Amino acid sequence: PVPSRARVYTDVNTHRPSEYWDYESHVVEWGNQDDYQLVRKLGRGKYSEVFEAINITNNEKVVVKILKPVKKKKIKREIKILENLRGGPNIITLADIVKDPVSRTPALVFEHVNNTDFKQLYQTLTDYDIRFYMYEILKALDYCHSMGIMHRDVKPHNVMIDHEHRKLRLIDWGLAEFYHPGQEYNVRVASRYFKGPELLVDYQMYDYSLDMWSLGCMLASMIFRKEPFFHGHDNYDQLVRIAKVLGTEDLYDYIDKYNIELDPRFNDILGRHSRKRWERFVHSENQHLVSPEALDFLDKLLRYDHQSRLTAREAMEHPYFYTV
Amino acid sequence: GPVPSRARVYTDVNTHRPSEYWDYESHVVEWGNQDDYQLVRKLGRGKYSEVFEAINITNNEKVVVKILKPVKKKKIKREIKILENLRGGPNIITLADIVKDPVSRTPALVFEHVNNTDFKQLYQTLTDYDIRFYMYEILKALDYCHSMGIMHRDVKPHNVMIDHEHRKLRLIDWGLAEFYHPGQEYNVRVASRYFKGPELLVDYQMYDYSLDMWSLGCMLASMIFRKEPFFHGHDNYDQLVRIAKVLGTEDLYDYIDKYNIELDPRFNDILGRHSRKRWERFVHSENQHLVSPEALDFLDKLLRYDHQSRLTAREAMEHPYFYTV
Numbered sequence: 187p188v189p190s191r192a193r194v195y196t197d198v199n200t201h202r203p204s205e206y207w208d209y210e211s212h213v214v215e216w217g218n219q220d221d222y223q224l225v226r227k228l229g230r231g232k233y234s235e236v237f238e239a240i241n242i243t244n245n246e247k248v249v250v251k252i253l254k255p256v257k258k259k260k261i262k263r264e265i266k267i268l269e270n271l272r273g274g275p276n277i278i279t280l281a282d283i284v285k286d287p288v289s290r291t292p293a294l295v296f297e298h299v300n301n302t303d304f305k306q307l308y309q310t311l312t313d314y315d316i317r318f319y320m321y322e323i324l325k326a327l328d329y330c331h332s333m334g335i336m337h338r339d340v341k342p343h344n345v346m347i348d349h350e351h352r353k354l355r356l357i358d359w360g361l362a363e364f365y366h367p368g369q370e371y372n373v374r375v376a377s378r379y380f381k382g383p384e385l386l387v388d389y390q391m392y393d394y395s396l397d398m399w400s401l402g403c404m405l406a407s408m409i410f411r412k413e414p415f416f417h418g419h420d421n422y423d424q425l426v427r428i429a430k431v432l433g434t435e436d437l438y439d440y441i442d443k444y445n446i447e448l449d450p451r452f453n454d455i456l457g458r459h460s461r462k463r464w465e466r467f468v469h470s471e472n473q474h475l476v477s478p479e480a481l482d483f484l485d486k487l488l489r490y491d492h493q494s495r496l497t498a499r500e501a502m503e504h505p506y507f508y509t510v
Numbered sequence: 511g512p513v514p515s516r517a518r519v520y521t522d523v524n525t526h527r528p529s530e531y532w533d534y535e536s537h538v539v540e541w542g543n544q545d546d547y548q549l550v551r552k553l554g555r556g557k558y559s560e561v562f563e564a565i566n567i568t569n570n571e572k573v574v575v576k577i578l579k580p581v582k583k584k585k586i587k588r589e590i591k592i593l594e595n596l597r598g599g600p601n602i603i604t605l606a607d608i609v610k611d612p613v614s615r616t617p618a619l620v621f622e623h624v625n626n627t628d629f630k631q632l633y634q635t636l637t638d639y640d641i642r643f644y645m646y647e648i649l650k651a652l653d654y655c656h657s658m659g660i661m662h663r664d665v666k667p668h669n670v671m672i673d674h675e676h677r678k679l680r681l682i683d684w685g686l687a688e689f690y691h692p693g694q695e696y697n698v699r700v701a702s703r704y705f706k707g708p709e710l711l712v713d714y715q716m717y718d719y720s721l722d723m724w725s726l727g728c729m730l731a732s733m734i735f736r737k738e739p740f741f742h743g744h745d746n747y748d749q750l751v752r753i754a755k756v757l758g759t760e761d762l763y764d765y766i767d768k769y770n771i772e773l774d775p776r777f778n779d780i781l782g783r784h785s786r787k788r789w790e791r792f793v794h795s796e797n798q799h800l801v802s803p804e805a806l807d808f809l810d811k812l813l814r815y816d817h818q819s820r821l822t823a824r825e826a827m828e829h830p831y832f833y834t835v
C-alpha cells in the first residue's frame with residue numbers, strides 16, 4: 187500500500203519528548219479507593235462497569251469506571267492520554283485512579299456528567315442545538331488532534347451531554363492512540379457503524395481524519411433522523427452500506443490511489459452502486475434539521491479519501507456554524 | 511499497667527477490610543521464573559539481604575533482585591503481602607516478581623531498579639528547595655501506606671532511594687513493615703537505633719503510624735542541620751538520653767506519666783536532667799542556607815515525645831514549609 191500522513195498536526199509527537207507519548211514507561215500512582223463510596227450502577231460497556239459515587243472527603247459526586255481484565259498496556263495508554271488531555275475543552279476530566287485494595291482491580295474516577303438520554307435528545311433538539319453541539323465536539327477533536335491524539339471511538343454513546351446546562355463531554359478514551367507519521371495502526375478500532383472506509387479496507391496508515399468520518403456519521407444520523415446512518419450487519423457489510431450512498435466508482439478510485447488490496451470476501455457482496463445525492467435523505471420528519479449548509483458540511487466529512495475530509499479546524503470555519 | 515493508645519488517623523482501616531487483605535500468613539505466594547533474570551552486580555547488603563542489579567532477559571530492562579537471608583518464613587510472607595497491597599502507590603517501590611533459586615530454594619524479591627544517587631555526594635549539593643521537594647515525596651508515600659493500614663517501621667535515608675537527575679524518589683525495604691490493628695501490642699525491636707521513636711525506647715508497645723513521623727523528623731533534622739545522625743545514641747538506652755539532651759527531661763516525664771509507662775531501671779543513672787533546647791541552637795554557618803522559620807516550626811511538630819501530638823503525614827503536607835512545592 188501507498189504511504190499517507192495527516193494534513194494537520196503531522197509532527198506534534200515527533201517534536202515532543204518520549205515522556206509525552208511513551209505510555210508504557212508512564213508511572214501511574216494509584217489513589218486509595220476508601221475516599222469513594224459507590225452509590226449505583228450508571229452504565230456497563232464492553233470493558234467496564236460504571237458507577238455513580240461520592241468522594242467522601244469533599245462530598246463531590248463522581249463516576250467510577252471499574253475496568254474489566256484487559257492488557258495492562260491498554261490501561262496505561264488510556265490513563266496517559268487522559269492525563270495529557272486533562273483540562274482540554276469538552277474533554278472528560280480524570281479526577282483520580284484507584285485500585286480496590288482486596289481485589290486489586292483498577293478503576294478510573296471521573297467528573298460526573300448528568301447525561302441526557304439519546305432517544306430523548308433525538309426528538310427535542312432544534313437545528314441550532316445540533317449546530318452548537320457539533321461545534322462543542324469539534325472543539326474537543328481539534329484539541330486532542332492538536333495534542334497528537336486520535337480518539338478512534340467517536341460515537342453518540344461516547345459523547346455525554348447535559349442539555350439543561352448545555353455541557354458536552356467527549357468520553358471513553360480506551361481506544362485512543364498517539365499519532366506518529368508513517369505508523370501502521372490496528373484497524374480493529376471504533377464501533378462498526380462509525381468505522382472509516384480506511385479501517386474496513388484494512389488500510390493501516392490512518393490518522394486524525396478517522397475521527398472526522400465518525401463525526402460525519404453522527405451528523406448524518408441527527409439531521410436525517412436515521413440512526414445509525416450506515417447500518418452494517420458485519421464489518422464487510424459495513425463497507426457495502428457506505429458504497430450504497432457514496433457509490434462504488436469513488437471506492438475503486440480510493441483503493442487505486444493508495445494501492446489497497448481489497449479482501450476477497452468483498453467479491454460477492456460489494457456490487458455496483460451509483461453515488462446518491464444527499465437531498466434524497468430529506469423527508470417531512472427531518473426537513474426542519476436539514477439546510478444547504480448542513481448538506482454541504484456533511485458532503486465534506488463523508489469522503490472515502492481520508493486526506494480529502496475536512497480537518498476539525500476547517501470544519502469549525504464552515505458556513506454551517508456561523509449562527510454559533 | 512500502661513494506658514491504651516490508638517492512631518488519630520486511619521485507625522480502623524484494617525478492621526473494616528476482609529482477612530484476605532491483612533492475613534499474610536494465609537496469603538498464597540506464586541514463585542516466578544528465576545531464569546528470566548541475569549545478575550549484573552552487587553548493589554547493597556543489609557541486615558536481611560544481598561541486593562543485586564539484574565537484567566530481565568525477556569525485555570532487556572534493568573531490575574533489582576533482593577536475595578533474602580535465612581529468616582522466619584512468616585516475615586517473608588508479610589513483606590510480600592505488604593508490597594502487593596501497596597503496589598502502584600505514590601513513591602512506593604514496585605515489586606515486579608517473586609522468584610526462587612531452583613537448587614538452594616532461596617527466595618528473592620524482584621523490584622523496579624532505581625539509579626540511587628550517592629548520599630555523601632547528595633549531602634552537599636541539595637538546596638533548601640530540594641529538601642522540601644524530597645520530604646514532600648516521602649510524605650506522599652507515608653500518607654499512602656498509612657491510609658492502606660501499614661506502618662513502615664524502618665524509615666531512614668538508606669531505605670529512601672533517590673534518582674536525583676530524574677527527581678525520582680522510592681521508599682524501599684518493607685521487611686519490618688506491619689499492618690496496624692488498633693490496640694495491638696507490637697515488638698519495640700524495630701527500626702534502626704538513630705530513627706527509633708521514644709515509644710520504642712521506653713518499651714511502649716501500643717504504637718502506630720506516628721512512629722514513621724518521628725523517623726521522618728530525624729531525617730529532616732539531619733539534613734537541615736547537616737548532622738548525621740541527628741540523635742547519635744551508642745545503644746538503645748543512650749538513644750533516649752540523646753533525645754532528652756535536645757527535647758529535655760520535663761516533657762519526657764510528662765509523656766511517660768500520660769501513658770503510665772514504667773521506665774526501665776537502666777535509665778536511672780544515665781538519663782539525668784536536661785533543659786529543652788531551642789531548635790535555633792543547631793543553626794551554624796555551614797547549614798544556615800537550609801534552615802528557615804518554617805523548617806524549624808515543621809521539625810518541632812514531628813519531633814515530639816507524645817506520638818499522638820505529632821503531625822500525621824496528611825497534616826505535614828499542609829504545613830507552610832511545603833508552599834513552594
Ligand SMILES: O=P(O)(O)O[C@H]1[C@H](OP(=O)(O)O)[C@@H](OP(=O)(O)O)[C@H](OP(=O)(O)O)[C@@H](OP(=O)(O)O)[C@H]1OP(=O)(O)O
Nearest residue numbers: 735736737738739740741742743744745748752755794796
Ligand atoms: O562530625 P563532627 O561535626 O565533628 O561531630 C561529630 C559528633 O560530635 P558533636 O555533636 O559533638 O560535634 C559526634 O559525637 P556525638 O554526636 O556522638 O556526640 C561524633 O560521634 P562519636 O560520638 O561517634 O565520635 C562524631 O564522630 P564521627 O564523625 O567519627 O562519628 C563527631 O565527629 P568527629 O569525629 O570530628 O568528632
Ligand SMILES: Nc1ncnc2c1ncn2[C@@H]1O[C@H](COP(=O)(O)OP(=O)(O)O)[C@@H](O)[C@H]1O
Nearest residue numbers: 229231232233234236249296297298299343358
Ligand atoms: N463521566 C461520566 N458521566 C456520566 N456517565 C458516564 C461517564 N462516563 C461514563 N458514563 C456512562 O458509562 C457508560 C460506559 O462508559 P465508557 O467510558 O464509555 O466505557 P466503555 O469503554 O466500557 O464503553 C457510558 O456510555 C455512560 O452512559
Ligand SMILES: Nc1ncnc2c1ncn2[C@@H]1O[C@H](COP(=O)(O)OP(=O)(O)O)[C@@H](O)[C@H]1O
Nearest residue numbers: 554556557558559561574621622623624668683
Ligand atoms: N529498588 C532498588 N533500587 C536500587 N537499589 C536498591 C533497591 N532496593 C534496594 N537497593 C539497595 O540495596 C540495599 C539493601 O536493600 P533493602 O531492601 O533495604 O534490604 P535490607 O532489609 O536487608 O536492608 C539498599 O540500602 C540499597 O542500597
Ligand SMILES: CCc1ccccc1-c1ccc(CN)cc1Cl
Nearest residue numbers: 304307316319342345404405408
Ligand atoms: C446523534 C449524534 C449527534 C449529532 C449532533 C449533535 C448531537 C448528537 C448526539 C446525540 C445524542 C447523544 C447521546 N449521548 C450524543 C450526541 Cl453527540
Ligand SMILES: CCc1ccccc1-c1ccc(CN)cc1Cl
Nearest residue numbers: 544545547609610611616617618
Ligand atoms: C543464586 C541467585 C538466586 C537466589 C535466589 C533466587 C534466585 C536466584 C537466581 C538464580 C539464577 C539466576 C540465573 N538466571 C538468577 C537468579 Cl535471580
Ligand SMILES: CCc1ccccc1-c1ccc(CN)cc1Cl
Nearest residue numbers: 629641644645667670671729733
Ligand atoms: C537525609 C534525609 C533526607 C532528608 C530530606 C531529603 C532527602 C534526604 C535523603 C538524603 C539521602 C538519602 C540517601 N538515599 C536519602 C534521603 Cl531520603
Ligand SMILES: [Mg+2]
Nearest residue numbers: 231343344358
Ligand atoms: Mg463507550
Ligand SMILES: [Mg+2]
Nearest residue numbers: 278357358359
Ligand atoms: Mg470514559
Ligand SMILES: [Mg+2]
Nearest residue numbers: 556668669683
Ligand atoms: Mg534497608
Ligand SMILES: [Mg+2]
Nearest residue numbers: 576682683684
Ligand atoms: Mg526493598
Ligand SMILES: [Mg+2]
Nearest residue numbers: 558684685686
Ligand atoms: Mg527487613
